Amino acid sequence: PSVGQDLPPVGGYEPVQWRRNLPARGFRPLVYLAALCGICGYGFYRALGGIQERRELKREK
Amino acid sequence: PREAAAHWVPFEDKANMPDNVPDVVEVGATSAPLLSASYFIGAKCKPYNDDFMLCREESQGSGAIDCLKEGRRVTRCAVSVIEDINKSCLDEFRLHWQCLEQNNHQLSGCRKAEALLNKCVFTKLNLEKKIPGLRPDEEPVFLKKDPWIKPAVDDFKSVRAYAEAKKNGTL
């Protein structure tokens, strides 16, 4: 017979995840490039603006 | 010229000037007040400095012995400038050059005190700062309203004075 055996439930078990769950994420890449060149261009602006002022302070000195 | 190399002992000379060369007072002002007063001096000693360098050029080697009169007049013009400053605009001058000493003698860190000094000396001595060689288009850096480069720490006394002077309308 069977009395105290470790047996499954009557409705079975809820299904598990066995398939790949690596969801592609991120923006599309060209946005990351457009933020890159935009950050670069803003930094070049801010720096080359800081060079021309150093040029004038030197003219004063 | 170059600097000393590998060894060098300072050595003075306890002698006096020849009797045929008269006597002249020395400026006796150090690096910082002198750099503050550079522009007011140049605005007033321009012909004298130019005549000095011209007679040095014409002499062609004997400048150290032929240009003494011209260097003497230059030194006296300078002394008159600094005496006018200390008599009249002392505290503002002290604000400027102490604000400088607490930096690397970068003039950018002292613009407030520089403003008070230019105003006072222009009202009293009639001497204004001017950077030449510029076009009417270029904006001189000491009058820019929001410059890119700002000091690490705006000086305290300078800031209190600038605010009180805007409240009093002196600027």
Report chain B residues whose CB lies below 8 A from the CB of A58: none
Separation of alpha carbons B123 and B90, rounded Å:
14
Method: cryo-EM
Nearest CA to B106 among B154, B72, B60?
A: B154
3-class SS string, A38-51: HHHHHHHHHHHHHH
Residue in B131, B147, B149 closest to A60 by CB: B131
Largest Cα–Cα separation, chain A? 104
Nearest CA to B100 among B37, B163, B146?
A: B37
Please tell me what DSSP assigns to residue A13: -
List the structure tokens of B157.
Answer: 């006394």
Nearest CA to B138 among A30, A42, A55, A7?
A: A55
**Tokens 């020395």 label which residue?**
B26
Separation of alpha carbons B76 and B39, rounded Å:
16
For chain A, the distance separating the N- and C-terminal CA atoms, rounded to the nearest angstrom, is 104
Give helix then strand counts, H and E, for chain B.
7, 0
**Tokens 């480069």 label which residue?**
B149
**C-alpha Rg value of chain B to the nearest Å:** 20
Chain B residue nearest residue A48, CA to CA? B148
Whether B75 contacts B26, CB under 8 Å: yes
Q: Is B107 on the interface with A (CB under 8 A)?
A: yes
List the structure tokens of A38.
Answer: 């935009």
Whether B36 contacts B81, CB under 8 Å: no
Min distance B50 CA to chain A CA atoms (Å): 19
Separation of alpha carbons A39 and A24, rounded Å:
25
Report chain B residues whose CB lies below 8 A from the CB of A57: 106-108, 141, 149
For chain B, the distance separating the N- and C-terminal CA atoms, rounded to the nearest angstrom, is 45
**DSSP helix/strand/coil, B94:** helix
Report chain A residues whose CB lies below 8 A from the CB of B140: 56
Whether B114 contacts B107, CB under 8 Å: yes
Whether B89 contacts B99, CB under 8 Å: no
Which amino acid, A12?
G
| Inter-chain CB proximity B142 and A60 less than 8 Å | yes
Chain A residue nearest residue B129, CA to CA? A60
List the 2-61 stretch of A: residues with Cβ below 8 A of B. 46, 49-50, 53-54, 56-57, 59-61
List the structure tokens of B166.
Answer: 């805007």
Count of A-B CB contacts under 8 Å:
27
Chain A residue nearest residue B133, CA to CA? A59
Nearest CA to B34 among B123, B121, B115, B97?
A: B97
**Tokens 């809820």 label which residue?**
A14
Residue in A50, A60, A61 closest to B149 by CB: A50
Q: What angle do CA B131, B99, B151 make, to 5 degrees?
A: 75
Q: Is B142 on the interface with A (CB under 8 A)?
A: yes
| Inter-chain CB proximity A57 and B149 less than 8 Å | yes
